[PDB]
Design a protein around this ligand. Structure first.
Ligand code: NA
Length: 198
DNA sequence: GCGATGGTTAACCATCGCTG
DNA sequence: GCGATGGTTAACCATCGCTG
């Protein structure tokens, strides 16, 4: 189906958009071993975007600093999602552009934890954070992460502990969900979450 | 109608840790 | 000693996608 693996409520964009690839993770299985994906960050002249890619045929195309043109991709609350429905081509020279330094900078920065806490519940969070505590449990792995001004609990709920993380490492989070309500805000894993040592 | 997804509340029980 | 903190499970409420 054209919407296979795409997030609920995502909007199809048929028009081509050219982006420069900044980063991409290795592929990994999710949905209890049934599907694969990888995370990426790309930039246009005006914005950077987090990207979730479900078509493994594209892994070779998501190369650092290369320009690619994407169409029939989806937009899920600002996160670009790309499945087999999309077309991805190498960009024509006359479609390339310079990505402003401030965009590159933004795409690499991590929001302050105190600022993260002010966002709406359900907001997807990405970033690199110092680790204060780590606890491996039967059904979860939890962390206390911190920056210079604040700390927050991270809950990894996926039944799987094969995380490439070593003691002393900073923790890199992809697509965690801010949770709040009555009590302390936390970052909780979701179907697409990925965690690794920096 | 059901599966996937997912935020909130809360019960329950264990462990932690040490004066606002 | 004992209140605070933390893990697990579940109920509840909700939306979407597919139901050609
Ligand atoms: Na996939």
């Amino acid at each position: 189906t054209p919407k296979k693996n795409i997030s609920k409520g995502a909007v199809l964009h048929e028009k081509p958009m050219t982006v420069m690839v900044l980063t991409a993770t290795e592929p990994f299985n999710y949905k209890e071993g049934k599907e694969n994906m990888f995370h990426a960050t790309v930039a246009t002249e005006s914005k950077y975007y987090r990207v979730k890619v479900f078509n493994m045929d594209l892994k070779e195309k998501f190369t650092e600093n290369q320009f690619i043109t994407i169409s029939k991709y989806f937009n899920s609350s600002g996160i670009l999602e790309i499945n087999e429905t999309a077309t991805v081509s190498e960009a024509a020279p006359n479609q390339m552009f310079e990505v402003p330094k401030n965009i590159i900078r933004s795409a690499k920065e991590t929001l302050k934890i105190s600022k993260i806490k002010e966002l709406d519940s359900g907001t997807l969070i990405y970033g690199v954070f110092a680790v204060e505590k780590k606890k491996v449990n039967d059904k979860s792995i939890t962390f206390k992460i911190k920056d210079n001004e604040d700390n927050i609990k991270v809950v990894w709920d996926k039944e799987q502990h094969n995380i490439n993380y070593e003691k002393g490492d900073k923790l890199q989070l992809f697509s965690f969900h801010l949770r709040k309500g009555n009590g302390k805000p936390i970052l909780h894993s979701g179907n697409h979450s990925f965690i690794k040592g920096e």
